[PDB]
Design a protein around this ligand. Structure first.
Ligand SMILES: *[C@@H]1O[C@H](CO)[C@@H](O[C@@H]2O[C@H](CO)[C@@H](O)[C@H](O)[C@H]2NC(C)=O)[C@H](O)[C@H]1NC(C)=O
Ligand SMILES: *[C@@H]1O[C@H](CO)[C@@H](O[C@@H]2O[C@H](CO)[C@@H](O)[C@H](O)[C@H]2NC(C)=O)[C@H](O)[C@H]1NC(C)=O
Ligand SMILES: *[C@@H]1O[C@H](CO)[C@@H](O[C@@H]2O[C@H](CO)[C@@H](O)[C@H](O)[C@H]2NC(C)=O)[C@H](O)[C@H]1NC(C)=O
Ligand SMILES: *[C@@H]1O[C@H](CO)[C@@H](O)[C@H](O)[C@H]1NC(C)=O
Ligand SMILES: *[C@@H]1O[C@H](CO)[C@@H](O)[C@H](O)[C@H]1NC(C)=O
Ligand SMILES: *[C@@H]1O[C@H](CO)[C@@H](O)[C@H](O)[C@H]1NC(C)=O
Ligand SMILES: *[C@@H]1O[C@H](CO)[C@@H](O)[C@H](O)[C@H]1NC(C)=O
Ligand SMILES: *[C@@H]1O[C@H](CO)[C@@H](O)[C@H](O)[C@H]1NC(C)=O
Ligand SMILES: *[C@@H]1O[C@H](CO)[C@@H](O)[C@H](O)[C@H]1NC(C)=O
Lengths: 193, 116, 49, 32, 48, 48
């Protein structure tokens, strides 16, 4: 970046010490911290729980947030919409020295950055792994409630889980059982919004 | 402030599992916490129901779950297997049981009957 | 602090000085004079090439 | 063009290394 | 050698609308964690 | 750690109103939480 060949400049750069080494060390520390943050945020469960034997959740409908097994990427509908909403440039992530000198008339600044030593590194965890982690978390929180977080996952009907979560906020559980058909519908409508 | 001097209900804030106690220790330019946690183990399957009809009204458990060992129904607490006889003292009543879904026929015992 | 009043506390100052208060010169004990005569008073000077 | 990374265990263990060339194919060569 | 990292061991939960798992025993565990509190204090004499 | 894997009593920590459940989703360089909350309505006066 500073010299760009021109061996005289490289020789004259030696009298300035190890500034470049310090810069590289700081950048490497930041790069390591990014992956550490990602792993801390997402990698919290040891078991990759698979989807249960399929749709018996007391009338609740979780098809929107559950992963789609048909698409090549195991994302959900909401996750797909979120990925589509955020825009990113250079959706190949790789540019070798066979398309950087080509018919591009200096319209892309990716080559302008790359020709000056600026490089972008890939994250350790690809989105296809974050999707699996999220699917495992959803399966755990749907099938076993909060038990899987504190240890081994224990199965429990979803209606009873709703009843105990209602009890947790100071409301008697019976109120759920007398109004379940309402609540589920409301939930569906809510997610539909 | 939160874990050593009291008990915290926050999940995974101080160790994995339910939190009981913590002990602090010094270290060069740092502190070390030893957290004591309670972890369930040796789980078993059981058949459960939301409530029970005895006189035509729905009986809900005051605390715990309704389980069955195969032929008889009992009420037990959450994190430990402590079966007990279904009783009017550990259950309450709310409305008819035509609305509750999945309710199971059974008999509710009353300790007041033997004395009379 | 660049002020005429100082509040209560502790402050840092400059390093301790340790003045040398002595000058020492050490040179090789050469007593001869440099070739000033037979170099600047050379009768013939070589050509530039 | 193309950053280079060196992958190695502890030198107290072994002298073998691996080389990772970034943002390039292997088929296009300039790789060794 | 080079390989794709393993997210974790695969597992599944036998879910049904009338089955519940109840623990029958317990264990007491002790876990250690470490947190930095401070670092060394330094001073520099600019003129020297 | 607190909202997805359990139930939080902290007020307004995860959405407005009483907290029931949360669902996480991925996003480009980020996470999205869907919080389910219980909100009372249709209040009436009474003498106490
Ligand atoms: C849960 O919600 C989804 C979508 O709202 C439902 O899937 C729809 O089912 C109908 C009938 O087959 C189809 O015409 C739609 O095309 C489906 N929509 C989508 C996005 O796939 C699903 O039926 C609901 N499940 C339950 C039990 O109600
Ligand atoms: C389920 O619980 C009931 C009550 O304990 C069991 O009934 C008793 O079983 C023991 C032998 O295991 C007998 O000695 C008693 O006479 C039974 N009591 C009555 C009133 O009959 C029942 O056996 C248990 N069933 C299973 C599969 O565990
Ligand atoms: C619960 O688990 C503990 C072990 O963690 C069991 O204690 C052991 O019991 C066996 C005999 O069955 C002994 O040989 C071991 O020495 C015991 N270990 C310890 C640390 O005490 C305990 O028996 C289990 N509780 C029940 C009811 O089975
Ligand atoms: C409970 O039932 C499921 C399915 O039959 C089984 O996988 C599981 O092992 C059972 N639990 C125990 C402790 O055996
Ligand atoms: C549970 O699922 C079965 C379907 O196999 C159904 O017959 C039964 O009515 C369901 N019970 C409840 C409480 O949902
Ligand atoms: C439970 O008892 C009532 C009357 O006592 C009866 O009508 C009903 O059929 C019983 N429930 C079942 C599943 O048989
Ligand atoms: C060169 O010669 C003249 C006369 O002989 C003398 O005065 C002069 O000092 C000489 N120059 C030097 C550097 O000795
Ligand atoms: C290598 O070149 C081929 C030909 O276009 C291309 O398919 C491939 O994407 C290149 N390798 C990478 C990692 O992009
Ligand atoms: C309760 O009383 C106050 C004052 O009379 C009134 O403003 C309020 O509307 C009443 N609440 C309802 C639900 O009507």
């Amino acid at each position: 970046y500073i010299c760009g060949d021109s061996t005289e400049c490289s020789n004259l750069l030696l009298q300035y010490g190890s500034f470049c080494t310090q810069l590289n060390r700081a950048l490497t520390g930041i790069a390591v911290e990014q992956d550490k943050n990602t792993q801390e945020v997402f990698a919290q469960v040891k078991q990759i729980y698979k989807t249960p034997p399929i749709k018996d959740f007391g009338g609740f409908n979780f098809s929107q947030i559950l992963p789609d097994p048909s698409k090549p990427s195991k994302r959900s509908f909401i996750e797909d919409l979120l990925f589509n909403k955020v825009t990113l440039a250079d959706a190949g992530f790789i540019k070798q020295y066979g398309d950087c000198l080509g018919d591009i008339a200096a319209r892309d600044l990716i080559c302008a950055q790359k020709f000056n030593g600026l490089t972008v590194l890939p994250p350790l965890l690809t989105d296809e792994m974050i999707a699996q982690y999220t699917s495992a978390l959803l399966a755990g929180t749907i099938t076993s409630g909060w038990t899987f977080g504190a240890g081994a996952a224990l199965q429990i009907p979803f209606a009873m889980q709703m009843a105990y979560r209602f009890n947790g906020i100071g409301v008697t559980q019976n109120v759920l059982y007398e109004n379940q058909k309402l609540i589920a519908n409301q939930f569906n409508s809510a997610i539909g919004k | 402030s939160e874990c050593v001097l009291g008990q915290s209900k926050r999940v995974d804030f101080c160790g994995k599992g339910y939190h009981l106690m913590s002990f602090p220790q010094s270290a060069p330019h740092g502190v070390v916490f030893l957290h004591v946690t309670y972890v369930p183990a040796q789980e078993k399957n059981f058949t459960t129901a939301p409530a029970i009809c005895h006189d035509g009204k729905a009986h809900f458990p005051r605390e715990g779950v309704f389980v069955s060992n195969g032929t008889h129904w009992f009420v037990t607490q959450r994190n430990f297997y402590e079966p007990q006889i279904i009783t009017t003292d550990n259950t309450f009543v709310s409305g008819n049981c035509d609305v509750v879904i999945g309710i199971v026929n059974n008999t509710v015992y009353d300790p007041l009957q033997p004395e009379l | 602090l660049k002020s005429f009043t100082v509040e209560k506390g502790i402050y840092q100052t400059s390093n301790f000085r340790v003045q040398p208060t002595e000058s020492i010169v050490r040179f090789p004990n050469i007593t001869n004079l440099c070739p000033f005569g037979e170099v600047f008073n050379a009768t013939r000077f070589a050509s530039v090439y | 063009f193309g950053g280079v990374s060196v992958i190695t265990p502890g030198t107290n263990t072994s002298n073998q290394v691996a080389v990772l060339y970034q943002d390039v194919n292997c088929t296009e060569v300039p790789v060794a | 050698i080079a390989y794709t990292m393993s997210l974790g061991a695969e597992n599944s939960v036998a879910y049904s609308n009338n089955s519940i798992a109840i623990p029958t025993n317990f264990t007491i565990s002790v876990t250690t964690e470490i947190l930095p509190v401070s670092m060394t204090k330094t001073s520099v004499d600019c003129t020297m």
